[PDB]
């Protein structure tokens, strides 16, 4: 999965 | 030998708050997020949450919205899922695994037993 | 939220023989970095879910080649090639692209022997 803290 | 303790069981009353923990054990516990997942009996899986003790931010599936809060203790290498107002409903087995950033799921507890009952 | 529609229910497969499974999501799975998210987790009983294959058809290091992944778009498939008593479980596809990240329903193999 991404990951819920990827996109910071 | 990367390791995540996970109690048991709970019973918890109808109701009632349930807090579950996972405790990472040889691994430096910032560098991933944990998440948690959910199994009813006989068959299915419901991701439930996240957790990541990097940038601090959380997340968790709209169906039990409003009911978890997902924290992390960083000194204790703990993260924490706390579930209120339980129903038969949320009688399951909850994991908990680890997430790096474009990962996958590469460790997991052993789970805890949720029963809601009187 | 993505919807994944995984098929059969139920699969027996006689020990040796190939076994596949199919998984269908409601909206594509790419992400914004140009990669697809798609997992495959095998849970055998009074375990755990296991991963077995990971961004659609690539395997980590202690799972088989028996094991294989393939997929466009809405469409993924997972094969087992060879299988073994010990394969027995409830395999399920996961799209780890966008939150909720979600499973499909689960397909229990049976071996026939």
């Known amino acids: 999965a991404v990951g819920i803290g990827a996109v910071f | 030998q990367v390791q995540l303790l996970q109690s048991g069981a709970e019973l918890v009353r109808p109701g009632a708050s349930v807090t579950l923990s996972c405790k990472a054990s040889?691994?430096?516990?910032?560098?991933?997020?944990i998440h948690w997942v959910k199994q009813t009996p006989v068959r299915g899986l419901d991701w439930i949450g996240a957790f990541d003790p990097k940038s601090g931010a959380s997340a968790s599936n709209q169906k039990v919205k409003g009911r978890a809060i997902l924290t992390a203790d960083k000194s204790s290498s703990t993260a924490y899922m706390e579930l209120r107002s339980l129903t038969s409903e949320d009688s399951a087995v909850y994991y908990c695994?680890?997430?790096?950033?474009?990962?996958?799921?590469?460790?997991w507890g052993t789970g805890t037993t949720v029963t809601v009952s009187s | 939220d993505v919807l994944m529609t995984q098929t059969p229910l139920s699969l027996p497969v006689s020990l040796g023989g190939q076994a596949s499974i199919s998984c269908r999501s409601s909206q594509s799975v790419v992400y914004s970095d140009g990669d697809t998210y798609l997992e495959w987790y095998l849970q055998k009983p009074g375990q755990s879910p296991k991963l077995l294959i990971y961004?659609?058809?690539r395997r980590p290091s202690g799972v088989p080649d028996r094991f294989s992944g393939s997929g466009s778009g809405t469409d993924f498939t997972l094969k087992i090639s060879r299988v073994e008593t010990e394969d027995l479980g409830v395999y399920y596809c996961?799209?780890?692209?966008?939150?909720?990240?979600?499973f499909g329903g689960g397909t229990k193999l049976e071996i026939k022997r």
């Open positions: 996961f799209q780890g692209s966008h939150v909720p990240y979600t």
């Open positions: 695994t680890r997430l790096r950033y474009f990962g996958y799921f590469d460790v």
């Open positions: 040889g691994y430096a516990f910032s560098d991933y997020e």
């Open positions: 961004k659609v058809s």
